């Protein structure tokens, strides 16, 4: 895409050690699946195109971009070693939304709804087996 957007986060790297754990399986089959199909998922399903949105300061402010499309691909590609790396990606995504936007903005209300659902799902994350 545009040279004015940054390259998206890595989803593949043969040098990075990888594992499938029951927790990671849960994060794909339950957590991502639940959030991905939510009414409010669409702003989070791909990286922010700051050019298309006319937000030239977006990647001045957000230095750690993350989106659910990247998380989906990481999970599908078995990119992670553990669940905490994936949880951290979700946390980063929500925090970037809250940093860039204002309390009560539509996208923040959407993020808050998804984050509540995320927290409920993580409360049920199984012990690593
Ligand atoms: C995904 C994310 O961080 N959201 C940012 C975003 O698109 N804001 C639009 C405006 C205004 Br105040």
Curated annotation (Swiss-Prot):
Phosphorylation by CK2 disrupt the intramolecular binding between the bromo domain 2 and the NPS region and promotes binding between the NPS and the BID regions, leading to activate the protein and promote binding to acetylated histones. In absence of phosphorylation, BRD4 does not localize to p53/TP53 target gene promoters, phosphorylation promoting recruitment to p53/TP53 target promoters. Changing residue 106 to G: Found in a patient with a neurodevelopmental syndrome; uncertain significance. The gene is BRD4. It comes from the Eukaryota. Chromatin reader protein that recognizes and binds acetylated histones and plays a key role in transmission of epigenetic memory across cell divisions and transcription regulation. Remains associated with acetylated chromatin throughout the entire cell cycle and provides epigenetic memory for postmitotic G1 gene transcription by preserving acetylated chromatin status and maintaining high-order chromatin structure. During interphase, plays a key role in regulating the transcription of signal-inducible genes by associating with the P-TEFb complex and recruiting it to promoters. The record marks 101 as: Acetylated histone binding. This is Bromodomain-containing protein 4. Ubiquitously expressed. It comes from Homo sapiens (Human). Belongs to the BET family. It is linked to Cornelia de Lange syndrome 6: A form of Cornelia de Lange syndrome, a clinically heterogeneous developmental disorder associated with malformations affecting multiple systems. It is characterized by facial dysmorphisms, abnormal hands and feet, growth delay, cognitive retardation, hirsutism, gastroesophageal dysfunction and cardiac, ophthalmologic and genitourinary anomalies. CDLS6 inheritance is autosomal dominant. A chromosomal aberration involving BRD4 is found in a rare, aggressive, and lethal carcinoma arising in midline organs of young people. Translocation t(15;19)(q14;p13) with NUTM1 which produces a BRD4-NUTM1 fusion protein. There is a cross-link at residue 60 (Glycyl lysine isopeptide (Lys-Gly) (interchain with G-Cter in SUMO2)). Residues 19-125 form the Bromo domain. Interacts with p53/TP53; the interaction is direct. Interacts (via CTD region) with CDK9 and CCNT1, acting as an associated component of P-TEFb complex. Interacts with RELA (when acetylated at 'Lys-310'). Interacts (via NET domain) with NSD3, CHD4, BICRA and ATAD5. The interaction with BICRA bridges BRD4 to the GBAF complex. Interacts (via NET domain) with JMJD6 (via JmjC and N-terminal domains); the interaction is stronger in presence of ssRNA and recruits JMJD6 on distal enhancers. Interacts with NSD3. Interacts with NIPBL. (Microbial infection) Interacts with bovine papillomavirus type 1 regulatory protein E2. This interactions may serve for the tethering of viral genomes to host mitotic chromosomes allowing successful partitioning of the viral genome during cell division. The NET domain mediates interaction with a number of chromatin proteins involved in transcription regulation (NSD3, JMJD6, CHD4, GLTSCR1 and ATAD5). JQ1, a thieno-triazolo-1,4-diazepine derivative, and I-BET, a benzodiazepine derivative, have been tested on tumors with success. Treatment with GSK1210151A (I-BET151, a I-BET derivative) has strong effets on mixed lineage leukemia and promotes myeloid differentiation and leukemia stem-cell depletion. It is found in: Nucleus; Chromosome.
């Amino acid at each position: 895409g545009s040279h004015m957007n940054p390259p998206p986060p890595e989803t593949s790297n043969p040098n990075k050690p990888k594992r499938q754990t029951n927790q990671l399986q849960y994060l794909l089959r339950v957590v991502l699946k639940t959030l991905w199909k939510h009414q409010f998922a669409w702003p989070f399903q791909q990286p922010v195109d700051a050019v298309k949105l006319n937000l030239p300061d977006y990647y001045k402010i957000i230095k750690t971009p993350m989106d659910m499309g990247t998380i989906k691909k990481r999970l599908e590609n078995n990119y992670y070693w553990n669940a905490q790396e994936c949880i951290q990606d979700f946390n980063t995504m929500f925090t970037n939304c809250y940093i860039y936007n204002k309390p009560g903005d539509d996208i923040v209300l959407m993020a808050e709804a998804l984050e509540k659902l995320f927290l409920q799902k993580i409360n049920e994350l199984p012990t690593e087996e």
